[PDB]
Structures are given as structure tokens and as C-alpha cells.
Amino acid sequence: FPSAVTIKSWVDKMQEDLVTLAKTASGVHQLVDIYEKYQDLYTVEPNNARQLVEIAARDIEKLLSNRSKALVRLALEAEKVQAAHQWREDFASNEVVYYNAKDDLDPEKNDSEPGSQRIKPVFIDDANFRRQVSYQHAAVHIPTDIYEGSTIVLNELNWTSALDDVFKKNREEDPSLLWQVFGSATGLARYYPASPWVDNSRTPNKIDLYDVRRRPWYIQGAASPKDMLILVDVSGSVSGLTLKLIRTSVSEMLETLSDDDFVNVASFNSNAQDVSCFQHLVQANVRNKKVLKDAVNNITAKGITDYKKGFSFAFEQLLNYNVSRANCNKIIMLFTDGGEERAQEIFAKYNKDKKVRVFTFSVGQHNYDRGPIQWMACENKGYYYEIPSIGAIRINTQEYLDVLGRPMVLAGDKAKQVQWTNVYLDALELGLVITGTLPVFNITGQFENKTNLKNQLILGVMGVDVSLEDIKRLTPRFTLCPNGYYFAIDPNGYVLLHPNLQPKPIGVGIPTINLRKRRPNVQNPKSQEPVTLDFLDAELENDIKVEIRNKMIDGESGEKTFRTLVKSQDERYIDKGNRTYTWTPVNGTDYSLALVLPTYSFYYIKAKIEETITQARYSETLKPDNFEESGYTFLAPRDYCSDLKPSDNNTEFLLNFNEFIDRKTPNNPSCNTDLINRVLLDAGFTNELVQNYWSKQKNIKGVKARFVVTDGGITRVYPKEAGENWQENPETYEDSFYKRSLDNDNYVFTAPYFNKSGPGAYESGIMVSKAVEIYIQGKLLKPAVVGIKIDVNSWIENFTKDCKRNSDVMDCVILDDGGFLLMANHDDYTNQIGRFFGEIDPSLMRHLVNISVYAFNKSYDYQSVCEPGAASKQSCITEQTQYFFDNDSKSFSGVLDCGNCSRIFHVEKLMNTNLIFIMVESKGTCPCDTRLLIQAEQTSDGPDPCDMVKQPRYRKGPDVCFDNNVLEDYTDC
Amino acid sequence: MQLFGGRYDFEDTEVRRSNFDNFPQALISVFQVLTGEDWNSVMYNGIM
């Protein structure tokens, strides 16, 4: 086995060759020189991070205030218009004319069911709604199993007809408005602008199950948060049908709860116990509700009933105050069938003063006695419900929110505060939205102290949607490098705005279905949950990020520079970077906005091209015909002008952009002239480099391609026969190799993908890249990244020139930080290039992790897709692994023993790159192995929620709580 | 009432009116087995 100095010499020659080839054939210094030689087509402007966050925070505050103004308009008109309604019952003469959404519009139908008349709209097509929309009237949604034609429904479509004028005025004053909705307590939803529903009940074969009363925005604006305890009777008498209905009922009841409510499910039969692992009230997020639903589905029925024990248990659960709670609406929900005991002693002992409400549910068809539980309800300010069948569940488990809203109605105008929801996915396919809501009150006989009977409930909730792409237009990201960004935060942890938040649902657990119990045509239910992604599950988590999070959950301003691990765009690498987080509160709201800037991104380039000559020349440089002199050119699909839209066929976009820059003058009447000026400047620079330098050597020895990727958004790949092997994103802010080469100060090698369908090992090559970094006036800027593809075969034959091709005495590999194979020695190793080394030699890789030449970090992706196991693709949690270098030492010698064998090895880190060279004794000598070491998204289920609940994340609750008015009635029960 | 009383707790939603849950119901069920009408389905619910 060769000495240390022979291996040192081998790797020094190797890295000399590699680095000199990349340096002289990519043109880093040449581009630096042409960037610094101009210095007068541009100016270097500062990125004041504290001014940026405050500007953006005021723009977001102004948007949400403009929306809170259009809700207060709708609510006042709705109250005044219902106060003056007459309550007809004869509509067969005086019709109600309205547009029922989800009815078919081919004019050969002509239903117009009795008492009402239909509307056929015109339905222009629109942007800002990617569907066909009519600004003339409002559309009405009625749940499928609610007959329209009722006297309740027709009296509703009669007075809600005066909303359309405020809908129209709201939209006329703020043309950037999305959906405006009134959700009624009768099930109706009147929204503007009109648009056909996504699912009709009988049109196709998928029945739509949408009821406004179960929507997060409605439930949020209907009542205050809750401290719910669900007490489930599992005595023997509930066995059979009523137990099956109780399980379905408790799951439906849990689905009306959000992240500001706290829940636990207990159980009693002669002894009361928690149904789960939880033992107190927990925050009722998607993971905790998953735990509780799966624990409820395991319930069996045996024993004698003891209401006293169960109620003692419940009242003690609602008295902890040691754990995190809502402190708002202590309620018990008793799911039973029937009994003889009313437990007056326990109520006299435990809520003497009636601070805890009691809602009782009598489930099933049984002969038992219901007097006692109706009494329990009517005594403790609660309510009594009967659930005889499955079709009765949904409506009876969503109706307790009328009782909870009485003390909010009795509060008057103190209770009309706008609220914003979590991020959820629009039901009319608009993407990710938040909705700001407002409750509407029934005020009849108000100016005369008359009615106060029907007047303790609300009429419904007004809502107004705000899409997250409206909020991403107020935090513009094209003067920060690809590594900086904005992100906003709830007073709950959850993220309103982050790079890593996608439009997909959050996955819980491992997805498993039973394929042998699925009828083909029965219309599965889909989803109702929000996209609640905590801030510490969107990024890698230090100890400093936790205190930053806790600090800006408590509405604090601040700033902090530190050093952290950053995961790469493609989740395979990890860099170590310096970052600056600068945060502030959004003043009208409970959100907080922060800007992450990597130092080296404090200055940007603002173009100063103000003569037509060079502007026009630069505009000529990017035209497909002359590609063979500037190399294949890609353009970043941004919004440079309001007219040309991103196309995703990048040659189409380039043609449109050329047509647009020359057909309309560079005076740019309405375009973003800064983006266009920057793109033109950068095209000029990149073309100067391609002409003066890259063309003088049309081909180099091992150089397979050459590329420049700049800010502005220009990509140029020199031999156009490489231009179609280039599969990177054309948007230079999503290129993983760009962001990685900005973080390092040396050459970054990207490993190809292994076993990928397309040209990926010997067709393309191995990508090397380096960031161009310039000093204008003592300021650092990294405006572009140059690179190269290296030919595999040329590298092999410089690599073999005591390991030669297919030597069987030892192995020589070259890996990168990440553990991916780049240059092998064995011709069956080199067949798998770009594969994780622990998957082609797990023993030595585990030992390298053990020696601490490789560290690793594990994460969870909560928005992943999985092919379900046995117990299309559904949503899942997956665990991700990323390896990297921790120790800064150049050499690691050693000997790994499998026992009965001992392979001696030497690894040496190549200087000035991200490569490691390993020389180990061969593997086929001694048959020792344990198991593969995988670096891939592995479908997971954790973390364990029974432990996160014992030590939970810091949190801030709403401080407004409307319960306990003394003018309440509770004669209705 | 001793053999089948309180044992028709099948989890499905099928309705089985001829059971033995109280005395008037057991009396009706025995009378129906005596008239002979549909006695076999009373027997099947009792076997299951």
C-alpha cells in the first residue's frame, strides 16, 4: 500500500490538472475583468435590510387594511338589509331570480325549479382568476342535500340579493380583489364574481361535499377558541350501531377544530381513562388530530356506565392550567346513547358557577331514556343533539357553534374584529389563500328593544380572499441574490410566506389504503385541512433559529448575523453559510416579516444603459438565428412587461421577448425598466465573453460544454450542441448549482443523477462551476457563475495515467461532499456515476461517517408524495439525509476491519475544490458487508407526537375571548 | 330474552326489528316464529 507522500503527490497532480482546466477554460478571470473594465454602464447600490423589511411590512399592512375595509362595507349593508326583510312564504308568485352555481348551462334544459327563476350568464375568461368569471352578478352555492325551494332558503336568496351592489362596488374600488363571499347559517354561500362550481353533484359522478359551515374561515369567524374535552361512552349498551356512529361522529367533531383550539378525548365505563397517549389538552393541529382519530377508531364497548367518574375526569382535565391552553371556552361534549343518572352532585361540585358548557349527543336508534342527558345539557348552558344515522352526523356535529357564538353577539361592536385564517387551498382552484372574515349579526327589533329571540345567533360570516401571490408581489426578490428571501410568520409558528411552502397538502404519517375494499364509483372524500407548515419544519433548525422564531412571535423588531447550515435546492447537499436575519412586526396584524440576506448580497448592480446604441446592440445579441456565435441562450421567465407572459417553452418566451423589446421602444412606457435594463446589460457582458474568449478555442481537450449563468437572467451555453443537453431551470434563481457556487469560495462539482431517464453520465459530463466575484470600489459582488462540463472519458484517462482499470487489489474513487461517486477505477463503479457511495460500498462509507470525515443532517419533508403501501400517489412525510464535510483536515489514513479482514485505506481531500480521493483495499477479497446506507427520500411517519406534546414549541394565543355573557338565554337546548 | 337479548349488536346499519330486547318485542318475535313467517331470518340473525 503506497506511502502518504505518493498519494499526496498523486492528488496534488490531480487537483492541479482539474483546477487549471476549469479555471482557464471557463473564463472566470476574463469575466471578472470585463465586469470591472466597464464600471460605468452600471452603479453599485446598497441593500439596506432594515429599510427593506419596513417598506414591505407597510405594503402588506396596507393590503390587509384595504381588504378589512371591504369587509366592513359588506357586513353593514348585510345587517341593514336583513333588518328590513319581511319573511314572505308565497314565492310561487313573486319569484327569486338567481344564478345557482353548479347547474349546467347548455340552454336546452330550462329547469327553473318552483318559486325561483334561473340566470344564464355570459362568462368571459379572466386572469387573476384562472377560470371563466362573470362580473355581472353573484353565484350561489347550496349544499347538495339542502333543498332549495325551502322557505328558509328562498327567504335567504331574497334578501341576500342586495349584496351584489356592494360586491360590485368593492370590486370597482379595488380591481385587484379576489373572491368575496357571504356564508350563511342556512348553508348558502353567495360569492362574487359568479363562476361555475368545480364539482356538480349529478353532472358527472363525483358528488360535491362542500358546506360553508365547515370551512375554516367560517368556523373562525363564528366563535372564539375552545378548550374541548370529548367524553365518549364505551359501556356495553353502546355496542353495535351506536358505537360505529359514535366513532364517525367524533372524527367529524374533530374536523371542526383548528390550531387555536385544544382538545382531548376521554372515555368512561365504570372507569374513566384517556383514549390515547395524550393525558391532557393538546393543540389540535393536523398531527395531534391524526393521533386522536386513530385512537378513537380502536374503541370497543364493554362494562357498566358511570357518568360520575367520567364527569369527574372531564372536569379535572379542564382544570390543569399547567399546560398550554386557550383559556377561552371550556366545553364538554358527551357522546352517549341514553341513561338513568343525571349526576347532579358532580355538577354542583365542579361547575357551581357554570363556567363549563355541556353539549350532549344521543347517538343511534335505541330504546334507552334520554331525559337525563337533555337535563345535563339544559342545566349547564349547553345543548342537546340527536344523531340517528350517518347522514345526520355532519349537520349535528357542526351546529354547536351557534351556542358558542351567543356571547359574541351580545358583545356588539367589540366583537367585530377582522381575522385572517391559516394558509389553505382555495376550493375554487385559486392556489394558496388566506381569508379575512367578519361575523354578521341579526338585528331586528333593534331600534325598539323588540325581538331578542332569534337575535342571539349570527346571520353568517363575510369573507374575502387574498392569494399568496399578491403578497409575493409586495416582497420582490430580484435585487437580492438567489440566496436571500422574505418570510412571514404567524403568532403560532406557522409560515405565511416562505420559499419552501408548496401548494400541496401537509402529509401526516404513512399513507396506506385497502385496495380490496374500494367500490369503483362512490366518490371518495378529499380534504379540508390547511397548509400549516411550522417555521422550524421549512428550514434546517439550529438553536439560534428557535430563539429568532420565539422573538418574532412576540412581535419584536430585531436583527441578527450568524452562521448556519443551508440545504441545497435539490435536497442532496448542505453548505455552511453566514446569514443575516432582520425581522419586524406587521403593525396592523399579528404577522411578522423577516428578510434573510447572505452577506456578499448587501450591494446589487443597477444598470445605467441610457443611450440607444448599446441598448440596441445588446438587444441584438439575443436572437436565435445568431446562436451559433453567442451560444444557445436562455432567458429567465420573469415579468419584465405586463403584456408578455411567462410561457415555459423558453424559445417561445425568448421570441416573444425579442418581439416585445423591439416592437415597443426601450423607453418602456409601462414595463419594469429595471429588470429589462439589467437583462440587457448582462446579455451584453455574457456575449462579450463568449465572443472574445470562448470562440478563440472552439474546442478544448476534455471540455464538453461551457456555460455562464448570470443574474438578470441570461444563460449562455457555448457549443449549441450542448444547448439541448442543458436541463437546468432557465430561471437563474432556482438553479441549485448557482446557489451552491455562491456559498463556496472554490470550485463546486455537481454530481449527475444516477439511473435517470435521459442523457446523464457520458452524454452531458460532470459539471464544475465557480462564482465570478468582483470588487468595484472595495465592495464584494458575485453577479454571475461560470462553469464547464468535463468529459468523463478524458477524466478517466487522466486518472489512470497503484490502481489501473479494473485492478482487483484495491479501489480508487473520487467523491464530492455529499458522498456521490465522480471518478472511479473499476469500470463497474464508473457505470454508476452520481450514485451515493454508501450504496456501492456501504462498509467504508459507514466508517467514513464514523471517522468524522463526513457529517450528516436529517430532516423531514412534510409535503411529499408517496405510493401507498398495503395496510394515484398520496401525501406523506419523508425523511431526508444530507452529508457534508465537517472537519477541516486534508488527510485521513486508517484501516477498517470487518473482523477476519482488514482493508487499509487512505483518503485525502483535494485542495481548492469539494472533492475527496479515497484509496482503499479491494472489496472482493473478504466477503464482509452489513447493509446499504441510503441517501434518499425515505417515506417516514415520525416525529413521535406523544413526545412533542410534552415539550411543545412556544406559542401566542389570541387574547380576545367572548364567552360568558350574563344576558345569555340558554332556554334553547 | 336470555339467549338473544342484547346480542343483535351487529355493527352494520341493517335494521332487525324482530329481536328479543324487551318482553313485548320478544313476545312479538316468538309469535312470528309460530305463524312461521320469515322465521328463517330470525334464525339467521340468531346464528350470526
From Swiss-Prot, chain A:
**Which loops or segments lie on the Extracellular side of the membrane, by the record?**
1-973
Locate the Phosphoserine modifications and list their residues.
S93
Describe the processing and modification events after translation: Proteolytically processed into subunits alpha-2-1 and delta-1 that are disulfide-linked.
- Which CDD domains does its entry note? vWA_VGCC_like
The protein's UniProt keywords, in alphabetical order, are: Calcium, Calcium channel, Calcium transport, Cell membrane, Disulfide bond, Glycoprotein, Ion channel, Ion transport, Membrane, Metal-binding, Phosphoprotein, Signal, Transmembrane, Transmembrane helix, Transport, Voltage-gated channel
- Where is the protein situated, by its record's location annotation? Membrane; Cell membrane
Q: Which residue ranges does the UniProt annotation give for the motif MIDAS-like motif?
A: 233-237
Q: Which GO-annotated molecular functions does the record name?
A: calcium channel regulator activity; metal ion binding; voltage-gated calcium channel activity
**Domain Cache: where?**
420-511
Gene3D superfamilies for this protein = PAS domain (3.30.450.20), von Willebrand factor, type A domain (3.40.50.410)
A Gene Ontology cellular-component term: T-tubule
Where along this sequence does the record place binding of a divalent metal cation?
Answer: D233, S235, S237
Residues of this chain annotated as glycosylated in UniProt = N66, N110, N158, N298, N322, N587, N755, N850
Residues forming the VWFA domain are 227-404
Q: List the disulfide bonds.
A: C378-C961
- Role played: The alpha-2/delta subunit of voltage-dependent calcium channels regulates calcium current density and activation/inactivation kinetics of the calcium channel. Plays an important role in excitation-contraction coupling.
Q: What is this protein called?
A: Voltage-dependent calcium channel subunit alpha-2/delta-1
Tell me the organism: Oryctolagus cuniculus (Rabbit)
Swiss-Prot record, chain B:
Q: Which residues lie on this side of the membrane: Extracellular?
A: 5-24
Domain of life according to the entry: Eukaryota
Q: Which residues lie within the membrane without crossing it?
A: 25-46
**Which residue ranges does the UniProt annotation give for the motif Selectivity filter of repeat II?**
35-38
Binding residues for Ca(2+), per the UniProt record? E37
Q: Can you summarize the PTM annotation of this record?
A: Phosphorylated. Phosphorylation by PKA activates the calcium channel. Both the minor and major forms are phosphorylated in vitro by PKA.
Q: Where in or outside the cell is it found? A: Cell membrane, Sarcolemma, T-tubule
Hey, what tissues is this thing expressed in?
A: Detected in skeletal muscle T-tubules (at protein level).
What does the protein in this record do?
Pore-forming, alpha-1S subunit of the voltage-gated calcium channel that gives rise to L-type calcium currents in skeletal muscle. Calcium channels containing the alpha-1S subunit play an important role in excitation-contraction coupling in skeletal muscle via their interaction with RYR1, which triggers Ca(2+) release from the sarcplasmic reticulum and ultimately results in muscle contraction. Long-lasting (L-type) calcium channels belong to the 'high-voltage activated' (HVA) group.
Entry similarity comment = Belongs to the calcium channel alpha-1 subunit (TC 1.A.1.11) family. CACNA1S subfamily.
Subunit structure, interactors included: Component of a calcium channel complex consisting of a pore-forming alpha subunit (CACNA1S) and the ancillary subunits CACNB1 or CACNB2, CACNG1 and CACNA2D1. The channel complex contains alpha, beta, gamma and delta subunits in a 1:1:1:1 ratio, i.e. it contains either CACNB1 or CACNB2. CACNA1S channel activity is modulated by the auxiliary subunits (CACNB1 or CACNB2, CACNG1 and CACNA2D1). Interacts with DYSF and JSRP1. Interacts with RYR1. Interacts with STAC, STAC2 and STAC3 (via their SH3 domains). Interaction with STAC3 promotes expression at the cell membrane.
Task: Reproduce the free-text note on domains from the UniProt record.
Answer: Each of the four internal repeats contains five hydrophobic transmembrane segments (S1, S2, S3, S5, S6) and one positively charged transmembrane segment (S4). S4 segments probably represent the voltage-sensor and are characterized by a series of positively charged amino acids at every third position.
Q: What is this protein called?
A: Voltage-dependent L-type calcium channel subunit alpha-1S
Residues shown, of full length = 578 to 625 of 1873
